[PDB]
Amino acid sequence: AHAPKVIVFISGSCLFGAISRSLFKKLPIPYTVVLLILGAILGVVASNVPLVEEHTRDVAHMDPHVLLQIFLPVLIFESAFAMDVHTFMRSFSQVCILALFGLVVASVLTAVLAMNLFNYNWNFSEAMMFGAIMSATDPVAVVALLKDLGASKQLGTIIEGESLLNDGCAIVIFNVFMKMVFFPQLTSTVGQNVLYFLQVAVAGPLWGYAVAKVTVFFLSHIFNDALVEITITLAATYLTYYIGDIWLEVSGVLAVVVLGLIVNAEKTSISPEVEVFLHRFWEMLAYLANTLIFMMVGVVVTQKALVAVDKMDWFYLIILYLAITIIRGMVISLFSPILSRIGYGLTWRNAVIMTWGGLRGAVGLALALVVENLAGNDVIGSKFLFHTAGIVVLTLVINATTIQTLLRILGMSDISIPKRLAMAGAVRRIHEGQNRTLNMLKSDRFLADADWDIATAACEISDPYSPSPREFADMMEEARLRMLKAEKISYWKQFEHGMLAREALRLLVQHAEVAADEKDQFILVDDLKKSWQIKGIYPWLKRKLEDLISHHMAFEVTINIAIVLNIVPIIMEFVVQDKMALQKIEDALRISNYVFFVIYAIEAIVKILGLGRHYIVSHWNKFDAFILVVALVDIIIAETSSIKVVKLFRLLRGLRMLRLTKALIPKLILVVNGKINNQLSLGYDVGKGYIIGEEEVGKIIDRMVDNKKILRELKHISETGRLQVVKELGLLQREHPGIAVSVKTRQAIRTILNHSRETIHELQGAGLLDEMEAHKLELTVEIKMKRLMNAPSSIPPPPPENLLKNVSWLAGDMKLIDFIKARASLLHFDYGEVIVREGDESDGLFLIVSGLVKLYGKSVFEDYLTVGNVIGEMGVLTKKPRNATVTCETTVQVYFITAEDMNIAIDTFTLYPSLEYRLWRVVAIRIATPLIMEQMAFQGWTQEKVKLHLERGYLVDLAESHFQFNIDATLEDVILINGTAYNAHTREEIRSPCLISRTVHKLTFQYTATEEPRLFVVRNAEYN
Ligand SMILES: Nc1ncnc2c1ncn2[C@@H]1O[C@@H]2COP(=O)(O)O[C@H]2[C@H]1O
């Protein structure tokens, strides 16, 4: 049988592909040409050696139904899967216009050329097949160069997407015309052609979308079963293609393209291991398909094609190559006016790169082989295959090689100075580390005899890339570029620790790089605003739907299931008895459906009774009664011509479905919630990342630039942008409560799980945890993380009493929570009201539970606070006039706790975690964060890292002595929160929130109660 033998041939193909790919890695030409040469050699051998001819012939000739039904789906799905879906979607308008219309025009022009130039005297359909074959490209070679050489990813994504779309459309057009050429059919009605177009073009993407959504849905509900995920993902593609193309007659390739794009986009629903495995697997399948196709082309072109090739054919091939290149260039130029004014916008040199990069690939050869096989013995098949192979060889020999030099000639090859400098710095750092380790290793007793001459040569890494106003302006530009670079660094740091998702980092870095190329330009809040600006369609849909949705626990699901049951007889009988108009089926159906209608009616009556006659007050109940009456009338008058019978079969058949829609509406609400959540999460991530980056860059810039004027101006710019962004973010919470709460909780759980994984890794590195149980714990962590993606899109906002239950200093003891609850008074305000003035006397605590408040006051401080923040916290502790004004921005609502009530609580709650201790720790962390930051800014720690580190610290009891001695061997950082302190030795006075210097071995204070000392310290991870 062929089953094992084809495996032998396929393995031989893999071996030849490996040889060609390896032995000529450093040569310019791609390995596919070598594969073609090997195939030609094998073909000529088989033509003269019957021994191997018998073996080869039985498998070399492949049926058209293995190429189209297997190879092409593999190639197309692999091409789609490896695509960066987000950038593709963001350029989709331009890429789709170009792909579709350019393909149509190019194929038409190529067909016209073929008809006019070639003496084959083909008809138009054959010429269209020819043009469709010649218009399919495969730039995988050029996209790699554009990816490696410089940050021109816009061009690479555009060209790859154009390749994908034109390949799909070329396959569709070829399928359409191949039928007219080789499987002629009777003249079709215009409506028939319209329906054919709808089936091929519209039904394909819809079928693919449906299957993709179902597949991702099921994937989201699989945990710790990587094998099942892989199997489902693989089976989905082939089932989609087969059902679409064979059974539904729908264009399979487009469905597969849509499935690939969707599955690639929804990467979060797939465990990362499965993601990488699938990527590699599909790449390998595409590689095998390419090698097989190329070798088959060589074999068959030598066997039976070149025998029917004349001198004029070579001239025709050369002319055709020139003509197709010129046609692609002309198409790009013709569409340039439109493309330039949408999406990225192609530059003059980008057009040349695209034109020259139009490499033809395996898809064209597969279609040519299909044509050749179908032709059988006509010259048309041989000529088609010869021309396609010639074009592919020419492109892979000329374009695929000269593209590298043309990149330089156009000036796109050079790597930018910033990347060169970064690479040089990294190389120098690596060399210094290598020198350190080399020096260290020579001390080992068990490595002293090492031949360092060899070691140095082996490990070394080489550089891969180897006061005047006119002066003040130069300084200003230099500082601007510096700050942009620092912002980029901060964004990357945030991402690497998981503070941000990949898309947010992409957007932020794109904006930062764009802002550099404009004079005196900085990242603008308005530019970022588009990220978190919710498209109005979905809010409009939610608002409209919520109106419509506005007797025990399951009396409605029962009727829903009843409709879900009886849809089947209604849909089936009235569209089956038309054919059948066996008997006992109708005998049962008649009375069974009649009694079904009766039971529904009686259940409606039961609920009318259990709820009273007011049941009919509801709007939808009126419709239910109406459909009940219609069914009653028709059935009863039947039980008492066709047109008085089809009033059931068509009309009532239609009406019975309608009342089911009242269950779909809630699900559509939940789906719109998911969409709005997906947008709002990205908006929040972008805004938060920008704010954090600005905060850090302010600290860094404080010391980076010496020029005081530039320092002041840049700090003003940064603060002005940050305040705008934070206010804009705050408004969103008011706009959509539930979705905001959902996103916030999601991110909180994500961060907690990330730190849990980090702790597990730390434990394993230390060895305290066994090398195996770590994987069990990490598995639990990973499944818990994946369960987040299924979290509800919206969560009802917690009531205020819960907000009091969760404040950091209250939460640890329900006796204190129930005490403070008994006295807290809820207050309300209007826009513009002032809660506290600067320098007024102390009244108590405010906990903000709704709305937004703006703070202003001398340290100069201007920022906004939102729900869950505590305000006035120092005024009950230090018994001092207020440090700032707080003004309401949007109908603020707050809990207030009076100074007397706090004094009583503090006097009455003095367990080990003293209430005063908790209150001072919450003040101390917020006051110390900036102090630690400004000292540690240059170093690696981020603000989140600084806060988490400080969290380990504690306040000193500071009652045994009014002098503190510091053990640097066990103490990491020392912060004086409040009080007056002085060094024991030098007696220098400290009377401010200050970071204690290292040299201070012993501190000293005074007994005066006018400023009670409060010292916060952080100890080493070890004891003491
Ligand atoms: N730099 C700041 N950052 C955040 N909150 C502040 C800042 N400065 C002052 N506040 C708050 O403003 C409040 C005004 O009243 P209190 O001084 O009692 O307590 C103050 C703090 O809660």
Curated annotation (Swiss-Prot):
Gated by voltage and stimulated by cyclic nucleotides which shift the activation voltage closer to resting membrane potential. Not inhibited by common sodium:proton exchanger inhibitors such as amiloride. 3',5'-cyclic AMP binds at residues 872, 874-875, 882-883. The keyword Cytoplasm does not apply. The keyword Transport applies. Residues 502-517 are annotated as: Interacts with the transport core domain. One of its GO terms (molecular function) is sodium:proton antiporter activity. Belongs to the monovalent cation:proton antiporter 1 (CPA1) transporter (TC 2.A.36) family. Homodimer; the dimerization is stabilized in the presence of phosphatidic acids. This is Sperm-specific sodium:proton exchanger. It comes from Strongylocentrotus purpuratus (Purple sea urchin). The lineage of its organism: Eukaryota, Metazoa, Echinodermata, Eleutherozoa, Echinozoa. The gene is SLC9C1. The chain holds residues 72 to 1195 of 1325 of the full protein.
